[PDB]
Amino acid sequence: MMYIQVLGSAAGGGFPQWNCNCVNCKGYRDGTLKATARTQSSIALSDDGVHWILCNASPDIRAQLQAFAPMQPARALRDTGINAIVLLDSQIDHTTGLLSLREGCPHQVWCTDMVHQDLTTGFPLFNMLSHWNGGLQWNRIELEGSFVIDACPNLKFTPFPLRSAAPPYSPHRFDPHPGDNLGLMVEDTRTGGKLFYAPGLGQVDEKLLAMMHGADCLLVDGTLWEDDEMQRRGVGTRTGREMGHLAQNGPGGTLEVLDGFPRQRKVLIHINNTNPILDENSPERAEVLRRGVEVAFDGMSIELLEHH
Amino acid sequence: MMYIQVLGSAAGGGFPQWNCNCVNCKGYRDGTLKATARTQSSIALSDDGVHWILCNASPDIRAQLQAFAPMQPARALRDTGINAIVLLDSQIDHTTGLLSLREGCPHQVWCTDMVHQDLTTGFPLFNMLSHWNGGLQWNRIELEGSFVIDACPNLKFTPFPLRSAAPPYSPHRFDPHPGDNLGLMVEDTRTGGKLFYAPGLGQVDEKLLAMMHGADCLLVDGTLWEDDEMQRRGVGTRTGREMGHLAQNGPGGTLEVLDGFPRQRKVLIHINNTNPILDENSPERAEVLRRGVEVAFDGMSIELLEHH
Ligand SMILES: [Cu+2]
Ligand SMILES: [Cu+2]
Ligand code: NA
Ligand code: NA
Numbered sequence: 013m014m015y016i017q018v019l020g021s022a023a024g025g026g027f028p029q030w031n032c033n034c035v036n037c038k039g040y041r042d043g044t045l046k047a048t049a050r051t052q053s054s055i056a057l058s059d060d061g062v063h064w065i066l067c068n069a070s071p072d073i074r075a076q077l078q079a080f081a082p083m084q085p086a087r088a089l090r091d092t093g094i095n096a097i098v099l100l101d102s103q104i105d106h107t108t109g110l111l112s113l114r115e116g117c118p119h120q121v122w123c124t125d126m127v128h129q130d131l132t133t134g135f136p137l138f139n140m141l142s143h144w145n146g147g148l149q150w151n152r153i154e155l156e157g158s159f160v161i162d163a164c165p166n167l168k169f170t171p172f173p174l175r176s177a178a179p180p181y182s183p184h185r186f187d188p189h190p191g192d193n194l195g196l197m198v199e200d201t202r203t204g205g206k207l208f209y210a211p212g213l214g215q216v217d218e219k220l221l222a223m224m225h226g227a228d229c230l231l232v233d234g235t236l237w238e239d240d241e242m243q244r245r246g247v248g249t250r251t252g253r254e255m256g257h258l259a260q261n262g263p264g265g266t267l268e269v270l271d272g273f274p275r276q277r278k279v280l281i282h283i284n285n286t287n288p289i290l291d292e293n294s295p296e297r298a299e300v301l302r303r304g305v306e307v308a309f310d311g312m313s314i315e316l317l318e319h320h
Numbered sequence: 321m322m323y324i325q326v327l328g329s330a331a332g333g334g335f336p337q338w339n340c341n342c343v344n345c346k347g348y349r350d351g352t353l354k355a356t357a358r359t360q361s362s363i364a365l366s367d368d369g370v371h372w373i374l375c376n377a378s379p380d381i382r383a384q385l386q387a388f389a390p391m392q393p394a395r396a397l398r399d400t401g402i403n404a405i406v407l408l409d410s411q412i413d414h415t416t417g418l419l420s421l422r423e424g425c426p427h428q429v430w431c432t433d434m435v436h437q438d439l440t441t442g443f444p445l446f447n448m449l450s451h452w453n454g455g456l457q458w459n460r461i462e463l464e465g466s467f468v469i470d471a472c473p474n475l476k477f478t479p480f481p482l483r484s485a486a487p488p489y490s491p492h493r494f495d496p497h498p499g500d501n502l503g504l505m506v507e508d509t510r511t512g513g514k515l516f517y518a519p520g521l522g523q524v525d526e527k528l529l530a531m532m533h534g535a536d537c538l539l540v541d542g543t544l545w546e547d548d549e550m551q552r553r554g555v556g557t558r559t560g561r562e563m564g565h566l567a568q569n570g571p572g573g574t575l576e577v578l579d580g581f582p583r584q585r586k587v588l589i590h591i592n593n594t595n596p597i598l599d600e601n602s603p604e605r606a607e608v609l610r611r612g613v614e615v616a617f618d619g620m621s622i623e624l625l626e627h628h
C-alpha cells in the first residue's frame with residue numbers, strides 16, 4: 013500500500029489568491045460560487061501511514077501539516093511525521109515551506125544538483141538553515157536511475173526530466189539545464205503499484221506516454237482549462253506554454269491525452285485559481301467527471317493498492 | 321481614528337506549533353484544552369480603514385489576509401489593501417511573508433539599513449523579488465526621528481531602538497548593530513492618540529517607561545509567562561533573556577511593569593505556544609484579566625480614538 017495525501021491542490025497563489033478578484037476568487041469570497049479553498053500544491057507519500065515523504069514544501073505548509081493528523085504522531089514532546097522532503101524544482105512556491113520547518117532540523121532533502129545550486133545561491137535556503145541544528149542534509153537526485161528514501165523503504169522513486177525553466181531569481185534563469193525540473197514515478201516495490209506524478213507538465217511525447225501507460229494512477233497538471241486563461245479572466249498576460257502548463261481543453265490538451273488511458277486512475281492537481289473546474293457547478297467540471305477524471309482537493313487521500 | 325488589526329498574535333512557530341506536543345499544543349489538538357489557534361505575530365494599521373500598513377510579513381500571511389476582509393477591497397481584477405510594509409527586524413518569522421506577495425510588486429517596504437543589509441545578503445528577499453515587476457522598494461527607517469507613509473498620512477511612526485540581536489542567518493549575527501531591532505510608537509496626528517508597539521521586549525529602562533506613559537495603548541511582548549518556560553514544558557533550552565523576551569511573571573516581569581500604567585489599554589501579543597495564558601481556563605489567564613491586561617487573539621480589532 014502506497015498512501016498519497018494531497019496537502020495542497022492549487023497552483024501558485026492558491027485559491028482564492030490573495031490579490032485576485034477574478035470570477036472564481038471573487039465568487040468564492042462573496043459566497044456566490046460553490047467552490048472549496050485550496051492551498052498551494054504539495055503531496056505526502058508513505059508506505060506505512062506513519063513515515064511520510066513530503067513532495068514540495070509549500071508556503072502554506074503550516075496549515076497543511078496541521079490539517080493532516082499523521083503529520084503529528086505525538087511520540088515525543090517534539091515530533092513530526094515528516095521523514096524527508098523531495099523537491100521537484102527550486103520555485104518559491106515549492107520550497108518556501110522549508111523555512112517554517114527550521115526548528116525541526118536536520119531534515120533530509122532530496123533535490124537535483126541544479127536545484128541545490130539555486131538553493132545555495134539565489135534563494136539560499138540551505139545556507140540559511142545551516143544555522144539551525146545542522147540544517148538541511150542534501151541528498152542528490154541523479155538525472156538517471158532511481159532512489160529509495162530509507163524511512164519508506166518500499167517506495168522506489170524514478171524521476172523523469174521535464175523541460176527546464178529555472179525560476180526568475182535563479183543565477184541560471186536564462187540558461188536552463190537538465191535537472192531544473194522533474195516529475196516522479198513512484199513504485200511500491202511490494203505490489204508494483206505505480207504513481208505517475210507530474211504537477212507541472214508542459215508537453216507530452218512518446219516516451220512520456222509510454223511511462224504513463226505503465227502506471228496505475230496519473231496525478232497530473234490541472235493548471236489551466238485554456239492556454240490563454242489568465243488573459244480571459246483579465247488577471248494576467250502569461251500563457252500556459254509560457255508557464256510550462258498544458259491546458260485541459262483543446263487539441264493536444266491533457267483531456268485529449270488522458271482519453272488514451274481508460275484503465276488508470278486520473279486526477280488533476282495544481283489547479284490555478286482561474287480554472288473553471290474549481291467551480292463545482294461549471295460545465296467544465298461536469299466534463300471532467302464525464303471523462304472519469306477527478307479534480308484534486310485539499311485533504312484528498314489516494315490509496316494505491318496494487319498494480320493493474 | 322487609528323485602526324489596529326491583529327492578524328497574528330502568536331510567537332514564532334504559531335499555536336499550535338507544527339512539531340510541538342507540549343501541554344498546550346497537544347491539549348489543543350486533542351480537544352481537551354480551551355484555547356484558540358494563533359498565527360505568527362503581525363498587525364495592520366490604518367488611519368481610514370481602507371489603506372493599510374502591514375507591520376511584519378509573517379509566514380502565515382496568506383491565511384491572515386484572507387481572514388481580514390479589508391485586505392481585499394476588490395476595486396479591480398487585481399487589488400490589495402496592503403499599501404506598505406514596515407519591518408521591525410530581519411527575522412524569518414517577520415519577513416518570509418514578503419515572498420507570498422511577489423505577484424503584487426512593487427511594494428513599499430520600510431526597514432532600517434541593518435535589516436536591508438540582511439535582506440540583501442543572508443536572506444536576499446530584496447534581490448529575489450527584484451525579478452517580479454520592480455520588487456520591493458526600500459524606504460530607509462532612520463535611527464532618529466519619525467516617518468510618515470503617504471498612504472496613511474495621519475499616522476506618524478517614531479521607532480525606538482531595542483537591544484540588537486541579528487538573526488542566526490545574518491552576516492553580522494555575532495556583531496549586533498543599532499538598527500537590528502526596533503519597536504514603534506505610532507501617533508494619529510489628528511487626535512494625538514498613541515500606540516506603543518513592542519512585540520519583542522527584553523528589557524525596560526527609564527527612557528522606555530517615559531515613552532510608554534505618553535501612549536494610550538500598550539501592545540507588548542507576551543511571549544513567556546516565566547523566563548525558563550521552554551525548559552519547564554520540556555520543548556526547548558533557550559531562556560527568555562536568551563531570546564530577548566521579558567517574561568510576564570516575577571520580579572521585573574512585564575506584569576509588574578504594567579502595574580505602573582493603570583490608565584493605558586494593555587494588550588499582550590506575540591504569545592508563545594507554551595504560554596499558559598493561552599489556556600482560557602488557566603489561573604495565569606485569570607490573573608492577567610484581574611490586572612486589566614488583555615491577551616491578543618487573531619482577528620482582534622483595536623480602535624484608538626483619542627489621546628487620554
Ligand atoms: Cu506551484
Ligand atoms: Cu516572532
Ligand atoms: Na501498493
Ligand atoms: Na486616533
Ligand SMILES: [Zn+2]
Nearest residue numbers: 032034037285
Ligand atoms: Zn482568481
Ligand SMILES: [Zn+2]
Nearest residue numbers: 340342345593
Ligand atoms: Zn507547544
